[PDB]
XYZ file of C-alpha atoms in Angstrom:
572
model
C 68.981 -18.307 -45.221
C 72.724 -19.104 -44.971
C 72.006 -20.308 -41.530
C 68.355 -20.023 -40.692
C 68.981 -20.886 -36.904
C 71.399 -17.483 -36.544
C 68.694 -15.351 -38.844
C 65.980 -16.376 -36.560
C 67.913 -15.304 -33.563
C 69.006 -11.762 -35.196
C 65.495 -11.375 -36.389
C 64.027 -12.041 -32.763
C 66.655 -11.200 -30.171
C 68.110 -13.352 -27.669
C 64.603 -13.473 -25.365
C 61.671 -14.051 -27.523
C 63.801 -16.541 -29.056
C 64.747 -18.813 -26.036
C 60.814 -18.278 -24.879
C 59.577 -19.934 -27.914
C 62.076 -22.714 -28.218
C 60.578 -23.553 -24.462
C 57.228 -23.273 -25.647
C 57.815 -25.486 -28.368
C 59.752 -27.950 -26.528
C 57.141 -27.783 -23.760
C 54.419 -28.814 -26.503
C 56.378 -31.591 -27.729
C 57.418 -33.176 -24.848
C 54.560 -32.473 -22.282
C 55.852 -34.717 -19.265
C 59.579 -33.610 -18.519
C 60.532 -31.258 -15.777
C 60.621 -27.703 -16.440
C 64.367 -27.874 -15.917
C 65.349 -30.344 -18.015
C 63.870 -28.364 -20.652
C 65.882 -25.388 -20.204
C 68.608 -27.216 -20.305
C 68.163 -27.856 -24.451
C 66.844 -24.173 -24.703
C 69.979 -23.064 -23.765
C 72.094 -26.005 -25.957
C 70.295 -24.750 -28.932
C 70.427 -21.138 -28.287
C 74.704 -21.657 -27.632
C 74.483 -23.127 -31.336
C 72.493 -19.988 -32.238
C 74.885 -18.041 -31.322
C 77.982 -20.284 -32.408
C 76.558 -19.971 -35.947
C 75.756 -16.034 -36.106
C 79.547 -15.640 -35.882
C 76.171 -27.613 -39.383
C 74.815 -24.553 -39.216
C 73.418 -25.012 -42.738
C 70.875 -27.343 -40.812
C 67.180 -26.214 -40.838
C 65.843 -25.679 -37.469
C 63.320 -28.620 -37.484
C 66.569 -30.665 -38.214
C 68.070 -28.671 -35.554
C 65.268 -28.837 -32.976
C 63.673 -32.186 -33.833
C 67.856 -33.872 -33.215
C 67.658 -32.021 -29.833
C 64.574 -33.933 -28.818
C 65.880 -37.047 -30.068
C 68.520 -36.425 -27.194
C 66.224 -36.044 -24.078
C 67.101 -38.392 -21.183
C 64.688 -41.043 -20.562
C 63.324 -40.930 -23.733
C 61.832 -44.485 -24.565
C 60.447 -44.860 -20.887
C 58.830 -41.720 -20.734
C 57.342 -41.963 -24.560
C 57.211 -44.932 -26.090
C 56.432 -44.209 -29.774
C 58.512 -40.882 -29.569
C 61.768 -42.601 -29.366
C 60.567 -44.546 -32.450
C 59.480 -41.080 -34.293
C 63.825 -40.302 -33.859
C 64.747 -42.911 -35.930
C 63.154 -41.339 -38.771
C 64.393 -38.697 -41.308
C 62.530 -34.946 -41.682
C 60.286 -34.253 -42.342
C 58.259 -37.195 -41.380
C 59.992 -37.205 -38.017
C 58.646 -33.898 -37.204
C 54.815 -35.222 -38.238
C 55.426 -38.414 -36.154
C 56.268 -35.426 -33.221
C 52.685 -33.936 -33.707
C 50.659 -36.992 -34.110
C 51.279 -37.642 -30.681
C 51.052 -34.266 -29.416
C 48.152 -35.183 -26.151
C 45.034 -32.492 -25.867
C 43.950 -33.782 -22.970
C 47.284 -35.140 -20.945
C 45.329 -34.867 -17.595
C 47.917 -32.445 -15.946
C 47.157 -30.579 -12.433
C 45.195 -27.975 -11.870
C 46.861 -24.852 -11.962
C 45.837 -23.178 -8.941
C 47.377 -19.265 -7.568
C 49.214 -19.443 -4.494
C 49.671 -15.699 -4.331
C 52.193 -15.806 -1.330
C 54.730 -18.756 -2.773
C 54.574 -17.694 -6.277
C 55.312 -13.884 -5.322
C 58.608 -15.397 -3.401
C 59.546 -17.659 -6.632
C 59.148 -14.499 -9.047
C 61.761 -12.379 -6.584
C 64.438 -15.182 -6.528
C 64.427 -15.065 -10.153
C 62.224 -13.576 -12.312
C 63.554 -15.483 -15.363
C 62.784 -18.525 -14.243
C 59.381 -17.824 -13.083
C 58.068 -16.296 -16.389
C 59.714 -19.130 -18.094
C 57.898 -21.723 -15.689
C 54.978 -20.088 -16.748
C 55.361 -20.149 -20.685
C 55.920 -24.371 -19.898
C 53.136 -24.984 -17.824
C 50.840 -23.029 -20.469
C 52.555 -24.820 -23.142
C 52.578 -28.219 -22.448
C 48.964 -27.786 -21.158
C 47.760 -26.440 -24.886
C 50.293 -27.896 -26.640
C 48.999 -25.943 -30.227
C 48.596 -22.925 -28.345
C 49.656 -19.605 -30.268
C 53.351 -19.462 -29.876
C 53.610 -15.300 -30.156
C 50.549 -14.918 -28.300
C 51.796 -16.859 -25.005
C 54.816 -14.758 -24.624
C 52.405 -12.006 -24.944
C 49.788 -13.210 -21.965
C 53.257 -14.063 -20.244
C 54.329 -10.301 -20.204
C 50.570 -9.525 -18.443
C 51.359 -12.200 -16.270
C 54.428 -10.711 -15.399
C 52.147 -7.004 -14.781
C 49.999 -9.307 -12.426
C 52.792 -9.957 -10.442
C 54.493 -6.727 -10.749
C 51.748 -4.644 -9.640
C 50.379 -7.225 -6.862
C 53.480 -8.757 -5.154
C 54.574 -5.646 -3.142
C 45.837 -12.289 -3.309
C 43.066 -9.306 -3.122
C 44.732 -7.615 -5.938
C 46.129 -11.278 -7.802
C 43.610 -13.683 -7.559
C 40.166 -12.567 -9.941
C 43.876 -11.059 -12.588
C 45.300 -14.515 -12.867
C 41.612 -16.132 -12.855
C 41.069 -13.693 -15.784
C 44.115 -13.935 -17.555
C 43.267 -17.560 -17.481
C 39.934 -17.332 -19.071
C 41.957 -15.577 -21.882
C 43.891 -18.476 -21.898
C 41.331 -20.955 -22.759
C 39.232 -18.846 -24.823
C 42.685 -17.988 -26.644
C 43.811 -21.750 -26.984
C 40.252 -22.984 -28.611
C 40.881 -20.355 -31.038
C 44.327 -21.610 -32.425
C 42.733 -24.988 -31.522
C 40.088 -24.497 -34.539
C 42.604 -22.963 -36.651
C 44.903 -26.173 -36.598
C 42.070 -28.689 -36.446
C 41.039 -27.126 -39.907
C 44.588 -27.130 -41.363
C 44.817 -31.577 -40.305
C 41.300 -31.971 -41.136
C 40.191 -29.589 -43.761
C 42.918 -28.180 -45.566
C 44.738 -24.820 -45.781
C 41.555 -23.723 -48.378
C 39.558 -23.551 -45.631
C 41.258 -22.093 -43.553
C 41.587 -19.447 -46.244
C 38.006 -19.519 -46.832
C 37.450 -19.201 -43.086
C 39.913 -16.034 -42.966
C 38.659 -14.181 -46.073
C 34.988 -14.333 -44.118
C 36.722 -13.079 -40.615
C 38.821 -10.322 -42.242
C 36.314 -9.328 -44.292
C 34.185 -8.147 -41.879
C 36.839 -6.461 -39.714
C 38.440 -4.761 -42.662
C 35.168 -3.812 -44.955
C 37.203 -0.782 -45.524
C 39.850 -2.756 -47.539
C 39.968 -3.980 -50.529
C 40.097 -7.494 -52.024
C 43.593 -7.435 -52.771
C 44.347 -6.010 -49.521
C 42.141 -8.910 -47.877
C 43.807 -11.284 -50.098
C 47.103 -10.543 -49.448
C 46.678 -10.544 -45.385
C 44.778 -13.670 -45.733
C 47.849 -15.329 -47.367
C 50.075 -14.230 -45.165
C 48.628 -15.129 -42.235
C 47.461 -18.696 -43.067
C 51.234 -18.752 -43.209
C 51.749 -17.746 -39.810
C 49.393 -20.273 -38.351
C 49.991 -23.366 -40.694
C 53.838 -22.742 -39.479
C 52.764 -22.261 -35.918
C 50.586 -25.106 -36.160
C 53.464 -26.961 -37.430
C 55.586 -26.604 -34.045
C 57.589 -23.876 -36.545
C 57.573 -21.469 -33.755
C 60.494 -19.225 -34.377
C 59.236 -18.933 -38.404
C 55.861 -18.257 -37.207
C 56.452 -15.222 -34.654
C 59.063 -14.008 -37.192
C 56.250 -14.018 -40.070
C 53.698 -12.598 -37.818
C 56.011 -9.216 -37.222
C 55.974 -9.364 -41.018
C 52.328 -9.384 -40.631
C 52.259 -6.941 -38.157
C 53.912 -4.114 -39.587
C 52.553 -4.556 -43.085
C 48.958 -4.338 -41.537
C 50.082 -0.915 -40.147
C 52.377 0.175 -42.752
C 48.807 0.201 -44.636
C 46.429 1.260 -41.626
C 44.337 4.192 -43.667
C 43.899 1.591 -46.624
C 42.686 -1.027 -44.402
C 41.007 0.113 -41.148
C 40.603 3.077 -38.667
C 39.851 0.936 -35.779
C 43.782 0.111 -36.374
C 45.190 3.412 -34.993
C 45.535 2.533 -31.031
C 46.570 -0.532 -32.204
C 49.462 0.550 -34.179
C 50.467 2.977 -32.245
C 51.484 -0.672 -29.504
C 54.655 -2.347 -28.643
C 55.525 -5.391 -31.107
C 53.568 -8.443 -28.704
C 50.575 -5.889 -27.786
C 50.583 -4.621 -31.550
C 49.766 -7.970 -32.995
C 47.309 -8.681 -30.185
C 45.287 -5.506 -30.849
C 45.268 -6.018 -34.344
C 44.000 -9.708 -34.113
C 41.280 -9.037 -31.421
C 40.401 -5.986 -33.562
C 36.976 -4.473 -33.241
C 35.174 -4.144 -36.732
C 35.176 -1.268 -38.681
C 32.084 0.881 -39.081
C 30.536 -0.090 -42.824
C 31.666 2.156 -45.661
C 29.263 4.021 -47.413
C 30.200 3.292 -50.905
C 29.469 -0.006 -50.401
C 28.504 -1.686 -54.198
C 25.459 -3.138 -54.739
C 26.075 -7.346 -55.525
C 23.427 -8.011 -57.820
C 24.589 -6.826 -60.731
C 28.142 -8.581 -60.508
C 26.846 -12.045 -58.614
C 22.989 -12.210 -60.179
C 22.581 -9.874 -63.182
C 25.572 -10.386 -65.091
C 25.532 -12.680 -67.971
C 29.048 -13.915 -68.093
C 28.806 -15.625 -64.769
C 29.644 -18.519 -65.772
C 32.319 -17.733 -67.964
C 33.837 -15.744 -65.041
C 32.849 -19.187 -62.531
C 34.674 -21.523 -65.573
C 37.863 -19.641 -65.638
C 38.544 -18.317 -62.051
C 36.199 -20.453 -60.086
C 38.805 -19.646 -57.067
C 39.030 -16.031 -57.224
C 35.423 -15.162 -58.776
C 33.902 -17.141 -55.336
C 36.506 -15.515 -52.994
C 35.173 -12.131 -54.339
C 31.770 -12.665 -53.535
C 32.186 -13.821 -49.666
C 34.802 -11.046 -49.668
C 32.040 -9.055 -50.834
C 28.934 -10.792 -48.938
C 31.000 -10.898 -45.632
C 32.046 -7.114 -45.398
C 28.615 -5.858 -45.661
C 27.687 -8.678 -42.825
C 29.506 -8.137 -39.441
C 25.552 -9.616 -38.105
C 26.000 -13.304 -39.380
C 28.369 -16.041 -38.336
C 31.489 -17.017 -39.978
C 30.202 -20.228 -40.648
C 27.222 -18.912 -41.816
C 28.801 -16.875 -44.483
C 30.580 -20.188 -45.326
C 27.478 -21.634 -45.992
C 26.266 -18.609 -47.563
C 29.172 -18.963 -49.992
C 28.987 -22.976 -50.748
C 24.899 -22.386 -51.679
C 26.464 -19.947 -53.750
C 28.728 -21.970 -55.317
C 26.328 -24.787 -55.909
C 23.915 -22.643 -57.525
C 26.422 -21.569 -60.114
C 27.150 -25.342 -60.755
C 23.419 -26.315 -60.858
C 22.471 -23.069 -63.021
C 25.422 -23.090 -65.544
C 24.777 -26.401 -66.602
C 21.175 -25.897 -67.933
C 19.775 -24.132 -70.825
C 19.289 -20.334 -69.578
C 21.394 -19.709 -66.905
C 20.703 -15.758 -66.295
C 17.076 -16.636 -65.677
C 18.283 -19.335 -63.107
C 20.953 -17.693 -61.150
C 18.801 -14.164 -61.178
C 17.022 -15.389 -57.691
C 20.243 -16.499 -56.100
C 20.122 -14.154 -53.540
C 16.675 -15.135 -52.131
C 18.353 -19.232 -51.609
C 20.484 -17.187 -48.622
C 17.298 -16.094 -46.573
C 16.196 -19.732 -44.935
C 20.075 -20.285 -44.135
C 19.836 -17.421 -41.894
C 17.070 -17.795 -40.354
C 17.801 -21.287 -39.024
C 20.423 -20.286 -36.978
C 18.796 -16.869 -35.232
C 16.045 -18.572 -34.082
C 18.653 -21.298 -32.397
C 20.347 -18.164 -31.351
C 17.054 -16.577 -29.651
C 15.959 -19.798 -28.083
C 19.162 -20.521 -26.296
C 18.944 -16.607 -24.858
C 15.775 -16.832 -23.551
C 16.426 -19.875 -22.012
C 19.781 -18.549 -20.447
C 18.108 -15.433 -19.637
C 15.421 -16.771 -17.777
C 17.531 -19.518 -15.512
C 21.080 -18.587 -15.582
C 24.674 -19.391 -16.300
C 24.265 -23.131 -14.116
C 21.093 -24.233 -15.276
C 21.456 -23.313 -18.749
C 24.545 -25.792 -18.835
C 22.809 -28.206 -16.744
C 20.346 -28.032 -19.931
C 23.111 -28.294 -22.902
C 24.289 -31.280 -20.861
C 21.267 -32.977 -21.369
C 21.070 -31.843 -24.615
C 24.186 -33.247 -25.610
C 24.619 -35.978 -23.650
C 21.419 -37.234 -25.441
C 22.854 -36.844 -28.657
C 26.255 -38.722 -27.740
C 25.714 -40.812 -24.814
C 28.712 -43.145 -25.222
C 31.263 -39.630 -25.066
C 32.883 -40.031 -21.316
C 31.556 -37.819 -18.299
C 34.168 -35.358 -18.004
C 33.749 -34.292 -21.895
C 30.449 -34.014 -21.793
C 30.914 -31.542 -18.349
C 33.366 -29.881 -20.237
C 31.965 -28.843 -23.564
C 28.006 -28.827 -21.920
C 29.768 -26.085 -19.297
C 31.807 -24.653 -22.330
C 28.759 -24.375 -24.180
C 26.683 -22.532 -21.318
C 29.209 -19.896 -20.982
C 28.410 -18.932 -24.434
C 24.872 -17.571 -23.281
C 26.922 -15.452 -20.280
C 29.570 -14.473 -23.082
C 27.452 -13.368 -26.147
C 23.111 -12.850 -24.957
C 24.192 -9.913 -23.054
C 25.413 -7.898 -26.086
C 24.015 -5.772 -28.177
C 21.608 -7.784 -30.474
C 23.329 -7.925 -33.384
C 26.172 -9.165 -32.491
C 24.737 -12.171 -30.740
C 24.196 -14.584 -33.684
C 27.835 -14.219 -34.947
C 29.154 -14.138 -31.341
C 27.331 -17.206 -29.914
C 28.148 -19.320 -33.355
C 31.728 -18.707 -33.837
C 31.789 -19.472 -30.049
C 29.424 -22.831 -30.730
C 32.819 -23.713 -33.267
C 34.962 -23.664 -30.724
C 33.333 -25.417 -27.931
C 32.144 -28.419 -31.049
C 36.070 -28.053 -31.987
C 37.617 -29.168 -28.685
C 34.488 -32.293 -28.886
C 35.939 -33.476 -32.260
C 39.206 -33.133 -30.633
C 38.700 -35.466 -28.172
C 37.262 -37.803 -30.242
C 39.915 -38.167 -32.592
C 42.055 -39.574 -30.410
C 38.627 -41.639 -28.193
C 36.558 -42.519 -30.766
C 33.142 -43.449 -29.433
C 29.814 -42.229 -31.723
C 29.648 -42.618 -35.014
C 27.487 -39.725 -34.885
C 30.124 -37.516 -33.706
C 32.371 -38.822 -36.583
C 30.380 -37.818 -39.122
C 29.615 -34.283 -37.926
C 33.289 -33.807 -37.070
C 34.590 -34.933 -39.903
C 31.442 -33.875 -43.073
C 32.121 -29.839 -43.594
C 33.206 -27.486 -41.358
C 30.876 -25.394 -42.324
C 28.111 -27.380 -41.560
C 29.347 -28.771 -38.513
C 27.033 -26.755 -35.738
C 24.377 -27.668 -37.885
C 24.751 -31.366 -37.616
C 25.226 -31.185 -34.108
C 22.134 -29.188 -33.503
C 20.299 -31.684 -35.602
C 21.080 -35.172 -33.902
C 18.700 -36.103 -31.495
C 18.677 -39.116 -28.757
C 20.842 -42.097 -30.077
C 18.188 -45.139 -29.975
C 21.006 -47.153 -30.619
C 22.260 -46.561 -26.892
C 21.679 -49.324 -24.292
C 20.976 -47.062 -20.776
C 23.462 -47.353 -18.343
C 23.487 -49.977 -15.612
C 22.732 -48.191 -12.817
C 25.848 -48.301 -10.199
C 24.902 -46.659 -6.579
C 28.093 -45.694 -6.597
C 27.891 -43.127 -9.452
C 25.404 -40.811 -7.756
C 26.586 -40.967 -4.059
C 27.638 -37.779 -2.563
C 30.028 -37.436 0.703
C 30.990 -34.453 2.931
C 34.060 -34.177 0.727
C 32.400 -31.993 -1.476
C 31.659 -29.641 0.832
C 34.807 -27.701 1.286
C 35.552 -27.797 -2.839
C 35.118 -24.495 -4.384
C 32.029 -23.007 -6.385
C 32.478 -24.328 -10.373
C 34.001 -27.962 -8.680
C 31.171 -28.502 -6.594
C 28.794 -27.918 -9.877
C 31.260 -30.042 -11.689
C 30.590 -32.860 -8.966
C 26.976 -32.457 -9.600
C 26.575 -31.482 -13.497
C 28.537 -35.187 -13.600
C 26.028 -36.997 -12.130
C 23.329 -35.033 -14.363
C 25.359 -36.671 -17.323
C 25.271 -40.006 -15.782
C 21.349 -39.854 -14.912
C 20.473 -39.556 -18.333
C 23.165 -42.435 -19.301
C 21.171 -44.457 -17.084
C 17.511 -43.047 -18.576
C 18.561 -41.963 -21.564
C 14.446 -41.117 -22.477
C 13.598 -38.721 -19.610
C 12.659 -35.286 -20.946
C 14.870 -32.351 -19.383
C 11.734 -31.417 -17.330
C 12.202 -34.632 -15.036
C 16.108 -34.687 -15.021
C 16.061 -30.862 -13.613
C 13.623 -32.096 -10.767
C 16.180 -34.642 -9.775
C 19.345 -33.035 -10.097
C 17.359 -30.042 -8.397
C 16.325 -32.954 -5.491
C 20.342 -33.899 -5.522
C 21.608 -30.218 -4.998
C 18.842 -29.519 -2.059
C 20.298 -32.436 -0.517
C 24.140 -31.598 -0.850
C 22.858 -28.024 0.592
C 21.119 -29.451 3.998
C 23.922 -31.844 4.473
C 26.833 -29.428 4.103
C 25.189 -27.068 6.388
C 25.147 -30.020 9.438
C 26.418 -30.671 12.256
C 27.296 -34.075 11.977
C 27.787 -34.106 7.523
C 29.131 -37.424 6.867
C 26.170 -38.743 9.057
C 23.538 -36.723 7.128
C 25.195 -37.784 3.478
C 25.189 -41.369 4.791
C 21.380 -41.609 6.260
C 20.142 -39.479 3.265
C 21.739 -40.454 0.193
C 20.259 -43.285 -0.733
C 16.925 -42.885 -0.046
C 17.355 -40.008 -2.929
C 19.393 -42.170 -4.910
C 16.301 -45.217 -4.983
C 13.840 -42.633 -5.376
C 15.626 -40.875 -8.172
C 15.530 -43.652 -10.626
C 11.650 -43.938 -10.369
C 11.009 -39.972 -11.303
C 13.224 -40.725 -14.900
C 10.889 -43.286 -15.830
């Protein structure tokens, strides 16, 4: 573009524009105020406009210089001011290197009567308030997806402003939030760790199965274009990535008929909504001309001629092929469905009579699926037969067994993250539980690997964070207790409960309690589940009695430690 900064704006309009360059300055820079902020949204968007009438500058040049101009900027990050020295684009990868997952921000918490207040003042503001504290919160969320939940959170304020009506909406649209943010999460974390092949190899699987309707070229040429999209908004290329992902957008429904009929209320949508529908798309019914694979993947003899000379394209054809007529397994599944492929072909092309070899390899596919519905069935019985709590009180265990040196508030996290799989995905209709509860397993194992990179602790976890993606749930699901863990010295402390807790709501209470679960089986690392569910069971009775007292504090005081004595003796 002549000016790229001017052809963004013109593309976008005025709005969407400004809201981006805050969420991407909000991502960067996670600790300034939300006004300071504004203040270069508007400096760059005067330039914007200066230059649709250095303009020539790219906008990374353009928005990485405006950074480099932020008040404070040494005290408040001390390797940042040493990223503005350098030169793009290795200034801009200095920026994301220190982009903080876990910056240990407040609680956002709805204050329907203060909020409603802000919103009438200025609306403006308080949408744009919103988009940073989002941002800087998840700083990889989905750029054009944020100013899309921002517009429902302007409806939930809209509608409920003239608490009953707000509070279980913003709770909701919240949920969306983080569900939404481990999503892009994954995508990223496979672009730094993995490549862009698989994330290609990841979307051919996806799309495949929403689109079985399409064709390969079809799924090919979506897949290319949106690994372009994310890889730019996983880049902090905001502006290029929402401008793409219109691109996208109409294409997609320029082509609806071709590609899917589960498209039509979706394209039918205003811009934002249009590209939401179409990514949270519901799979399209299987075609009935469907062709059968073993002819072209089994029975052919050229394989390996075809394997030689497009080993790329011929491979992408089959999961293309193998994941549209599967909408019932896992993405990662059909990932490993496709690699067993693959390795067969390179096994079986090598020796003497190939055709007779890779005739069977169909039947290899059979034990990789069974491994994980039986995971899949165990975990819903389970969760069906003690609920949403206790099921996460198990995966806790579970996991903190397998990576006892991870810190107490991870372990919560992803053991609670984990648990609301089984509410999420056992209720549905059977089928759709394996691929529901596994992609959901990614993205709960994602946000682990996350916050190991930066706290390395396990080796354990190193290894299946950073061996295949594919086989990632897998190697989780396969470690068992560390021996190599020393138990915990036990600290009174640790496992002493006060009134306090009393007046916290529901899921912090839990939190409270689920943390000293985690900590019990620091301390006896060898206790089966069994025993560690009779104490944590003897801990909760106790917070019960005592919160329901006259005199609390008294009651947590004379009772605690007996329990806390007698505790250690049933985890022998």
């Amino acid at each position: 573009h002549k000016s790229e900064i001017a052809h963004r704006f013109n593309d976008l309009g005025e709005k969407h524009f400004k809201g981006l360059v805050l969420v991407a300055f909000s991502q960067y820079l996670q600790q300034c105020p939300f006004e300071d902020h504004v203040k270069l949204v508007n400096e760059v968007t005067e330039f914007a406009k200066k230059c649709a009438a250095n303009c020539d500058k790219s906008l990374h040049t353009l928005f990485g210089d405006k950074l480099c101009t932020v008040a404070t900027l040494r005290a408040t990050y001390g390797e940042l001011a040493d990223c503005c020295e350098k030169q793009e684009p290795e200034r801009n990868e200095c920026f994301l290197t220190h982009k903080d997952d876990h910056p240990n921000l407040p609680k956002l918490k709805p204050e329907p009567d203060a909020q409603c207040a802000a919103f009438q003042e200025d609306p403006d503001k308080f949408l744009g308030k919103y988009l940073y504290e989002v941002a800087r919160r998840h700083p990889y969320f989905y750029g054009p997806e944020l100013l899309f939940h921002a517009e429902e959170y302007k409806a939930d304020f809209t509608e409920c402003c003239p608490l009953a009506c707000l509070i279980p909406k913003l709770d909701a649209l919240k949920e969306r939030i983080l569900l939404s943010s481990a999503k892009e999460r994954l995508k990223c974390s496979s672009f730094q760790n993995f490549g862009e092949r698989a994330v290609k190899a990841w979307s051919v699987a996806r799309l495949s199965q929403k689109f079985p309707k399409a064709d390969f070229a079809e799924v090919s040429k979506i897949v290319t274009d949106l690994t372009k999209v994310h890889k730019e908004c996983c880049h902090g290329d905001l502006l290029e990535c929402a401008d793409d992902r219109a691109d996208l957008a109409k294409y997609i429904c320029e082509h609806q008929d071709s590609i899917s009929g589960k498209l039509k209320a979706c394209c039918d949508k205003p811009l934002l909504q249009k590209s939401h529908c179409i990514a949270e798309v519901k799979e399209d019914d299987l075609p009935s001309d469907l062709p059968a694979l073993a002819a072209d993947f089994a029975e052919d003899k050229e394989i390996c001629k075809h394997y030689k000379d497009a080993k790329d394209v011929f491979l992408g054809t089959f999961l293309y092929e193998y994941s549209r007529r599967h909408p019932d397994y896992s993405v990662s599944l059909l990932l490993r469905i496709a690699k067993t492929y693959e390795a067969t072909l390179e096994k079986c092309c090598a020796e003497a009579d190939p055709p007779a070899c890779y005739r069977t390899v169909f039947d290899q596919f059979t034990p990789l699926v069974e491994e994980p519905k039986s995971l899949v069935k165990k975990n819903c019985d389970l969760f069906e037969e003690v609920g949403e709590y206790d099921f996460q009180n198990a995966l806790i265990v579970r996991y903190t067994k397998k990576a006892p040196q991870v810190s107490t508030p991870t372990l919560v996290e992803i053991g609670r993250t984990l648990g609301k799989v089984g509410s999420r995905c056992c209720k549905l209709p059977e089928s759709e539980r394996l691929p529901c509860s596994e992609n959901h397993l990614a993205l709960a194992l994602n946000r682990l690997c996350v916050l190991h990179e930066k706290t390395p602790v396990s080796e354990k976890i190193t290894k299946c964070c950073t061996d295949s993606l594919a086989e990632r749930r897998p190697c989780f699901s396969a470690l068992e207790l560390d021996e190599g863990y020393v138990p915990k010295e036990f600290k009174a402390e640790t496992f002493t409960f006060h009134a306090d807790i009393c007046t916290l709501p529901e899921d912090e209470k839990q939190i409270k309690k689920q943390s000293a679960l985690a900590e019990l089986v620091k301390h006896k690392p060898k206790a089966t589940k069994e025993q560690l569910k009779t104490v944590l069971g003897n801990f909760s009775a106790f917070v019960a009695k005592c919160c329901g007292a006259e005199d609390k504090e008294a009651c947590f005081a004379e009772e605690g430690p007996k329990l806390v004595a007698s505790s250690q003796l049933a985890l022998a």
